[PDB]
Design a protein around this ligand. Structure first.
Ligand SMILES: [Ca+2]
Length: 223
């Protein structure tokens, strides 16, 4: 996250880290046994880490649970990043409390102008590299589809939205990928891609979770 603030320990209780020997992507806890992330984060041998603040120090609220199964969206296109979403099932159910909680899936799509919280452990610099140990947060509005498609001509589909600031300075970034965009208490997006980070006229682009609800519910009911 560039231009954000330190969320504070376990203030974002649905935030996950995906670990394969190291943090590589975020994710969101959607019930005791299921995580939603970005299909571009797919790897074999994932360990899910819940209850994290400092990802380098054991501070007492963690639960580290390996993944049983990963399901990448049937239509995911790695060249376009269209349908950039995947489901991870945990080998055992997480123990849910105040500091480790699921986030609700949406009933409606959220509109342009809605304010959202985006969080992750990703790069905090627009130029150069500097990875935080503690969780960082950003509040950012959803942009109009017009503005989004004018920023990324030919690249935005129905399954994406923009969020952030056209003036740059404030964005998500590499390492935040797969993580949550929560608006009005519901999971609306997943951190997917962008041109650089926090650059002027190049906002972040997010998977539009309200288009996948039926696919998520069906999947989890049968697996
Ligand atoms: Ca920790």
């Amino acid at each position: 996250i560039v231009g954000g603030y330190t969320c504070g320990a376990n203030t974002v209780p649905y935030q996950v880290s995906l670990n394969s020997g190291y943090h590589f992507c975020g994710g969101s806890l959607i019930n005791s046994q299921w995580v939603v992330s970005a299909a571009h984060c797919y790897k074999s041998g994932i360990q899910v880490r819940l209850g994290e603040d400092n990802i380098n120090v054991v501070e007492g609220n963690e639960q580290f649970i390996s993944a049983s199964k990963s399901i990448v969206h049937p239509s995911y296109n790695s060249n376009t990043l269209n349908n950039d979403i995947m489901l991870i099932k945990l080998k055992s159910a997480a123990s849910l409390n105040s500091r480790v909680a699921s986030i609700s899936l949406p009933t409606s799509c959220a509109s342009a102008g809605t304010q959202c919280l985006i969080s992750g452990w990703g790069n905090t610099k627009s130029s150069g590299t500097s990875y935080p140990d503690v969780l960082k947060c950003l509040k950012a509005p959803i942009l109009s589809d017009s503005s989004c498609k004018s920023a990324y001509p030919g690249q935005i589909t129905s399954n994406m939205f923009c969020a952030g600031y056209l003036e740059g300075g404030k964005d998500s970034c590499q390492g935040d990928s797969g993580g949550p965009v929560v608006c009005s208490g519901k999971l609306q997006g997943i951190v997917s891609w962008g041109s650089g980070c926090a650059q002027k006229n190049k906002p972040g682009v997010y998977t539009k979770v309200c288009n996948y609800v039926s696919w998520i519910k069906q999947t989890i009911a049968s697996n």
